[PDB]
Structure formats: C-alpha cells, structure tokens
Amino acid sequence: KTAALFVSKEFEEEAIALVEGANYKVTSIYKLPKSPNVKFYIQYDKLQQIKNDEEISTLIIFEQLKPRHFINIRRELKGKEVLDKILLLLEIFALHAGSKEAKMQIELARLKYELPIIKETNIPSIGIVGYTNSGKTSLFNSLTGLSPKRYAIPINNRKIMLVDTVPFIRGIPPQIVDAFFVTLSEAKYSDALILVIDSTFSENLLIETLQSSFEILREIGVSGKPILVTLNKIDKINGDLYKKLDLVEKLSKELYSPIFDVIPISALKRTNLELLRDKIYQLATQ
Amino acid sequence: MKTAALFVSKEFEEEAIALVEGANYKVTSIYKLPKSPNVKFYIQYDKLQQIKNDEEISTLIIFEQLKPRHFINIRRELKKEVLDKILLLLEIFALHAGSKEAKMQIELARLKYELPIIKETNNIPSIGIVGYTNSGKTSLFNSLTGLSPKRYAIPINNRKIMLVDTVPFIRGIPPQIVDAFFVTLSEAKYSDALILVIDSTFSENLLIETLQSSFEILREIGVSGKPILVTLNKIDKNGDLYKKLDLVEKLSKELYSPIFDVIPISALKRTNLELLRDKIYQLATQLSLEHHH
C-alpha cells in the first residue's frame, strides 16, 4: 500500500514515522503550499499529478482537512484513498488496538469525523511505550525478528509477550483524544513497560521528552509497575553517551518508581540488544 | 430465517411483531413484559434459562429499553443474541439503509448504545413503498414481488420496475436513534415515485390523522414533485369502503401534488392487484415520458 505525503519540513520527521507505522509505503513526499488551496487544500495540478499515477494508492496530507477538501479531493481521485492527520492517526490507533472498547472508541471517532464529510454534499506481558520515531517499532521488530504489533518472543527458556503499544503523540487533535487514551490505557494491563527514548536529542529536549513520557504515564494511571528505560539510537549520537545515560537514569528515578534499569541500545545496529534480552529475562523471572 | 422469543406488552405487541418480522425474524413464542422487572436479568431467570437451552430459538427480543446491566447479565448467559427496542430498530434501519450516511448514522448510534454497555464492564424507475408498520406495506411488497429482499425488480409488460420496501413510518422513536431513522427514511426522497399505503381499518378521524401524518412525514423528509400513488389497503377487513375511499381520495388530492391516483386494495387477499399493476405500468410510462423530446 503506497502513499503520497504532504508534510512540513518540521513535522516531516513525525509524519514519515507515522505513515510507515501504519503499514503505508512512503512513495512520494511534498512540502506545504505556502497558501493552501480553498477547494483541494493542495494545488490542483499536484492533485491531478497524484490522480495520474498508478503507483499511488493513497494520498496523505499531514494536516486537518475540512469536509469540503475531502469532498472535492475524493471527487477528483475517484478510486484512490485520501487521508489527513486525524484519519491517519485513527488508522494507527486501530492497528495497536487490542481491546474491543478501544476498537469501538476509535471507530466512533472515525464515524463522527466522516459524517460531516458526507453531510456537506506464566507468560509475562511487556508493553513497549514511547514517542513515535524513538525507535519503538524498530526495537519491537529487532526483538521479534519481524505487522502483529503483539508478538511473544522466547528468551532463554521463558516465553515473553511483547506489545508494541500506541506511540505517544504530540499535538493530538481534540476529536480523537478519547480514542487515543482508551488505546494507550491498554498499557496498564502489561506487567512491565519498556520506555523508549531518542538519545539524539539535546539535554533540554531529553529532559522534556522524559518528563513528558512519564507525565503521560501518570495521565493514564501507571503506578508501581517496573519500567525499563532504553536509550535508543545511540548509533546516531554526535555526543557523549554516559553523560546522557546518567542524566536519564537520575531524572527517571526522580520522576518515577520503580525503575528496573536504564540501558543504551540501537535497534537498527542491534547494539546491546543481547544485554536488553538479558534484562528482559531478569525482569520476567522477577 | 431466524427465530425469536418476543417479550412485549399487548398495546405494542402487534407493532412489535411486524417490526421483528420486518427484521427477517419468525416469532415462535410471545410473552408479555414482566410485572416487576428482574433486578438482575430483567427477564425472569428461569425463562431465560428455558430460552437459553431451546435450540429452536436463536434470538431473544425484548420490546423495551434495557439497562446496560441487563445486557451484560443476559449476554453472559446466552453465549445467542439479545435485542431491545433500540438495537432492534437499528438492526431494522441497517437492512433498509442503502446510503453510506444512513449506514454510518445507524452504526454510530449502535456503537454509541453498545459503548456504555461494554463501558459498564435499461430505464429502471425506483418506486418506493412507504407507510406505517400497520398499513400492510410488507404484504403489498410481497404480493407485487411474489415472495427477504428489501429491493426487488418486477416485470410489468415490457417494462421492469424497481420496487423499494422503504423503512416504515415509526411513532415514538427513542431520541437516541432519531437521526439514524430520519436519514434512513429520507432515502425515499431519491425515488422517482412513491406508493403511500394507508390503513383503512382506522375510523373517520383516525384515518384522516394517518393520511395527514403520512403526507406530513413525507414532507419532512423532503419529498416533493414526486408522483404519489395512494393505496387504501385492507379493504377486506369493512362496509364503509366507499365512505373512507372518498375521504382519502378527496383529502389526498388536497394534501399533496402530484397525486397519480388513489385506489383501494387488499394486500392479503390480492384484490385489485391487477389494476394496481396497470397503474404501476402507467406510472412507469409517465416517468419515462417526463423528460423526453
């Protein structure tokens, strides 16, 4: 399932991750029209370009489109799929959804958002949490060897259920707030959690990401559950590791308890994944 | 065809049966609403178990609004569907609904209702047949069709007409599913013509009220300009036929335009159906000649 993405240079990092995570292939990428169109939001010529390309099956614009935009765009594409930020996020929610209640909440938001468009015409369970593009999915895939979003991997002689929960999202549209939390709250069930953090950030950003990640966990009601913090993407660090490791370790234990451990990793390069496996086992045994 | 056990009061029984059967159910057994609803299951536990073990009964239908508590307790026992008035009506709308908006409205309302529940855990004209759930609508549809399909094409001479068994007019609809019903019924506005079925078994004033209400509803849903063929049904059920016929004919022509014709029929006894078919054909001819040069 291919896709054409229209995202700003700033949110492009976020969008690409979300798109790929939604089982979509990023076949094309475009900027944001300085002055968005009134009828189609994107310029008509580009729209026709998307229409005239058998290699594109889904148009994705990382913004909130008005019903008239969907009406006109769909009226032009006639056969291809069109998605905005809200529809994209909802699709992702449904993928990570594990409970029926979550399914319904997600579908409810989708319907409420789609109506106006047609109107105007014992095995332990570990939950991997963190912001998108923190390496979460990559970490999950590296451990599983893989879109299950919930795979039980054998470590030593113990079988462990890994759950790639819905990623933390910044700037969540009010419409899908309920659907999001109901989906994320599925993490409360997990016996333990793996908090994934992007190490590439600076100190000011690391502190923010940590405080935000833990804040969100409090918001859903996570308490007393063992949390293993993994400093991911150490392969793309243009600085020092221990300095950030000690910072993260200290700040985490100040913001939450119990903290099982804090280890640096690299989902892509497999760096320290064997150590992670060991720590996951020690946690499972515990 | 699915079987169902119906719990309903006497005043709503007749309407309940028609609605249930309209949802493709054969009512095998009928009970009245419990004097004092069961705190736990609403329905008497013993009766619930009896229906639970009766393989000749696939679905339980209670013609009343159940509390989320009841749905939960009843469902953990049946393992068989349980339907209250709201879920029943929504299930009925879904069968008629052909538009995406209606489907979504119905589904929305359903997901809504279920949310708390689980949260507490060439040249083919369309002729729509409209009327109340007591006008013998379905019977007429089945007679002209020869029968369930909610839409069915019938051959008349050299023309073939698409008959549409639209959702019946329903009185006292739960506020929760009003939007779902309205949209589903509004689909009748996209028909080229309509057959308004009228229950003749009503008295003088009641008949007028039914007729007036029928046209009023047809107005609310946005029907206008469409030729309407009024059929005074159940003439076999008596005596003052011509009396009520004249009132209907005269009142109808004064209530709406254009009125194609007004004919008396008996869906069950299949009386005057041939004439009806003729009128349908003539109507089809008119519709095909409307925008011609």
Side-chain angles (χ1 to χ4, degrees):
Chain A
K1 186 162 54 183
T2 63
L5 177 57
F6 290 75
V7 61
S8 59
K9 299 183 180 181
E10 56 191 42
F11 294 109
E12 184 170 0
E13 184 181 13
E14 189 76 8
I16 298 178
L18 297 169
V19 174
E20 295 173 344
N23 296 351
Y24 283 91
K25 293 185 177 181
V26 186
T27 49
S28 60
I29 300 179
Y30 300 89
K31 300 181 179 180
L32 263 46
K34 302 181 184 180
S35 59
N37 197 282
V38 176
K39 296 176 57 185
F40 310 99
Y41 188 90
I42 64 176
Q43 272 55 40
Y44 184 75
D45 62 326
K46 284 181 170 55
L47 179 62
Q48 289 301 326
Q49 168 56 217
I50 303 301
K51 176 184 178 181
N52 299 336
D53 191 347
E54 300 180 357
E55 291 182 334
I56 309 301
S57 63
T58 303
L59 173 58
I60 302 181
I61 311 175
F62 197 77
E63 259 291 349
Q64 181 169 344
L65 298 178
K66 303 302 298 180
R68 63 172 175 269
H69 296 297
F70 283 99
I71 298 176
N72 295 162
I73 294 177
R74 289 178 175 179
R75 200 98 76 179
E76 279 291 343
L77 297 179
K78 294 192 309 175
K80 300 183 179 181
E81 224 74 40
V82 62
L83 299 173
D84 68 343
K85 172 185 290 186
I86 295 186
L87 290 181
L88 177 55
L89 295 179
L90 288 176
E91 292 184 353
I92 299 179
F93 291 4
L95 298 177
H96 295 85
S99 64
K100 174 168 296 183
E101 180 183 6
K103 300 292 197 305
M104 302 177 58
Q105 285 287 5
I106 300 170
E107 182 63 9
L108 278 168
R110 173 187 169 272
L111 295 176
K112 291 182 179 178
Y113 192 74
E114 199 70 62
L115 288 171
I117 301 182
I118 196 175
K119 249 64 168 56
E120 305 178 8
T121 307
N122 192 6
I123 300 180
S125 181
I126 312 300
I128 305 178
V129 300
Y131 284 93
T132 317
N133 197 227
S134 67
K136 274 188 52 184
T137 305
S138 298
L139 183 162
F140 177 82
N141 291 350
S142 295
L143 294 181
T144 57
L146 302 167
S147 303
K149 299 297 183 178
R150 178 176 296 95
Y151 200 90
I153 68 171
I155 300 184
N156 292 159
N157 203 215
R158 307 201 101 269
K159 187 157 170 285
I160 306 176
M161 175 63 65
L162 302 184
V163 177
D164 188 8
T165 70
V166 56
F168 301 144
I169 300 179
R170 336 199 70 168
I172 301 179
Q175 302 87 345
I176 65 183
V177 169
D178 292 355
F180 170 83
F181 282 103
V182 175
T183 302
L184 178 58
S185 293
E186 298 181 2
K188 296 189 62 179
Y189 297 91
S190 296
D191 301 313
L193 298 177
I194 299 178
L195 178 57
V196 185
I197 301 298
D198 188 7
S199 63
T200 65
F201 299 140
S202 63
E203 289 194 355
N204 299 163
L205 302 180
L206 277 174
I207 300 179
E208 172 180 341
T209 305
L210 284 173
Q211 293 172 334
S212 297
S213 297
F214 287 107
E215 182 179 14
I216 298 178
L217 294 177
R218 314 188 204 106
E219 192 169 1
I220 62 179
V222 170
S223 179
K225 291 188 295 297
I227 291 186
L228 174 52
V229 182
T230 62
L231 209 57
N232 193 30
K233 295 188 176 185
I234 64 179
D235 60 321
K236 298 181 177 179
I237 296 184
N238 288 345
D240 175 41
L241 190 59
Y242 302 129
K243 186 179 184 182
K244 299 181 177 182
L245 191 60
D246 292 342
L247 181 277
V248 169
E249 181 187 17
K250 183 177 183 59
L251 186 56
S252 296
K253 296 187 177 182
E254 293 177 349
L255 298 174
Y256 184 87
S257 180
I259 298 297
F260 180 81
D261 198 8
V262 181
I263 63 180
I265 66 177
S266 180
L268 278 53
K269 306 303 179 181
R270 299 179 180 179
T271 304
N272 267 0
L273 285 190
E274 290 298 337
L275 176 56
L276 178 57
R277 266 179 156 266
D278 297 347
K279 293 300 179 179
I280 302 303
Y281 178 87
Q282 304 176 27
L283 186 55
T285 299
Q286 168 184 329
Chain B
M1 181 69 67
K2 302 162 297 181
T3 61
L6 180 60
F7 288 82
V8 61
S9 60
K10 282 298 178 182
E11 60 164 329
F12 292 106
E13 179 173 351
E14 193 178 41
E15 182 184 11
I17 298 179
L19 293 173
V20 171
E21 292 175 340
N24 302 335
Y25 287 99
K26 279 183 181 300
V27 181
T28 55
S29 62
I30 304 181
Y31 303 85
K32 74 163 179 294
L33 299 182
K35 152 188 164 55
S36 56
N38 190 306
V39 162
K40 201 65 160 297
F41 306 91
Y42 176 86
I43 297 189
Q44 222 58 28
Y45 178 74
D46 56 347
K47 193 96 295 179
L48 175 58
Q49 294 294 149
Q50 176 174 156
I51 301 180
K52 170 186 175 179
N53 299 332
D54 189 352
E55 298 181 356
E56 298 181 357
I57 301 180
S58 61
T59 306
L60 173 58
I61 301 184
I62 306 171
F63 201 74
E64 257 290 347
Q65 177 171 353
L66 296 173
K67 303 179 179 180
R69 171 205 307 167
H70 304 120
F71 276 102
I72 297 179
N73 298 164
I74 296 178
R75 283 176 176 174
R76 307 200 208 217
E77 289 291 331
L78 299 179
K79 303 177 182 179
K80 298 180 180 180
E81 302 287 357
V82 54
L83 300 176
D84 68 346
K85 187 202 298 180
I86 293 185
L87 290 183
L88 174 56
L89 294 178
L90 290 177
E91 178 170 324
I92 295 181
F93 303 153
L95 293 172
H96 291 87
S99 66
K100 181 164 298 180
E101 181 179 0
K103 290 178 65 284
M104 289 176 47
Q105 286 288 355
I106 301 168
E107 176 65 356
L108 177 65
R110 183 180 70 80
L111 290 178
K112 275 189 182 181
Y113 202 61
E114 291 288 347
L115 191 275
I117 292 184
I118 188 183
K119 205 174 189 303
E120 189 178 313
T121 293
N122 63 339
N123 309 334
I124 304 180
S126 294
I127 307 302
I129 305 184
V130 296
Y132 281 101
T133 314
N134 62 326
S135 62
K137 273 191 42 178
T138 313
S139 299
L140 179 55
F141 180 85
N142 296 341
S143 294
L144 293 171
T145 294
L147 298 175
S148 181
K150 212 63 61 180
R151 267 115 81 168
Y152 201 96
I154 70 172
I156 301 183
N157 296 161
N158 63 346
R159 301 179 179 272
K160 199 164 189 176
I161 294 76
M162 183 63 60
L163 295 180
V164 179
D165 187 16
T166 72
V167 59
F169 302 141
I170 307 180
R171 298 182 179 181
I173 286 188
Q176 316 173 26
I177 66 180
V178 168
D179 290 349
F181 170 76
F182 184 83
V183 178
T184 303
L185 181 56
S186 296
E187 293 189 2
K189 81 157 67 66
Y190 302 110
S191 297
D192 302 317
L194 300 171
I195 299 179
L196 179 56
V197 189
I198 297 296
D199 187 6
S200 68
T201 66
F202 283 107
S203 58
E204 180 173 354
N205 286 175
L206 289 181
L207 180 58
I208 296 179
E209 183 278 336
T210 303
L211 183 63
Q212 177 182 152
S213 296
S214 294
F215 280 114
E216 169 61 12
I217 296 177
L218 291 179
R219 186 198 63 83
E220 302 181 21
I221 64 181
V223 173
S224 62
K226 269 63 179 181
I228 302 303
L229 175 52
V230 183
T231 61
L232 190 57
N233 195 25
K234 299 182 178 182
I235 63 180
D236 62 330
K237 303 178 181 179
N238 50 4
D240 292 346
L241 169 57
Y242 301 101
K243 207 290 183 179
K244 298 177 180 177
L245 177 60
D246 181 46
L247 207 180
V248 170
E249 182 176 3
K250 191 173 306 175
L251 202 61
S252 293
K253 74 162 300 180
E254 295 299 335
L255 285 175
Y256 182 91
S257 179
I259 294 294
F260 183 81
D261 202 5
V262 178
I263 77 175
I265 64 175
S266 179
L268 280 55
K269 307 304 178 182
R270 296 206 177 194
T271 305
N272 296 315
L273 293 194
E274 188 64 19
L275 171 59
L276 178 53
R277 297 180 60 88
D278 294 345
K279 292 301 178 180
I280 302 300
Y281 178 85
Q282 300 181 13
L283 178 57
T285 298
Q286 169 180 321
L287 290 172
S288 61
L289 294 177
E290 286 191 355
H291 317 278
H292 187 94
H293 178 89

